[PDB]
Amino acid sequence: PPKKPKKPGXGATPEKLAAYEKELAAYEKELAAY
């Protein structure tokens, strides 16, 4: 099963947050495919 990405907390930067959105959408895609 695809690993769930962790949200940057406390000190998140928009770039890493965007990467989180990408990896989250990817997680949803791989979870859906699974």
DSSP string spanning the chain?
-PPPPPPP-SS--HHHHHHHHHHHHHHHHHHHH-
Is residue 5 a contact partner of residue 27, using CB atoms and an 8 Å limit? yes
AA letter at 26: A
Burial class (CB in 10 A: 0-12, 13-18, 19+), 2: middle
Is residue 20 a contact partner of residue 7, using CB atoms and an 8 Å limit? yes
Determine the distance from the C-alpha atom of residue 27 to the mean position of all C-alpha atoms in its chain, rounded to a whole number.
6
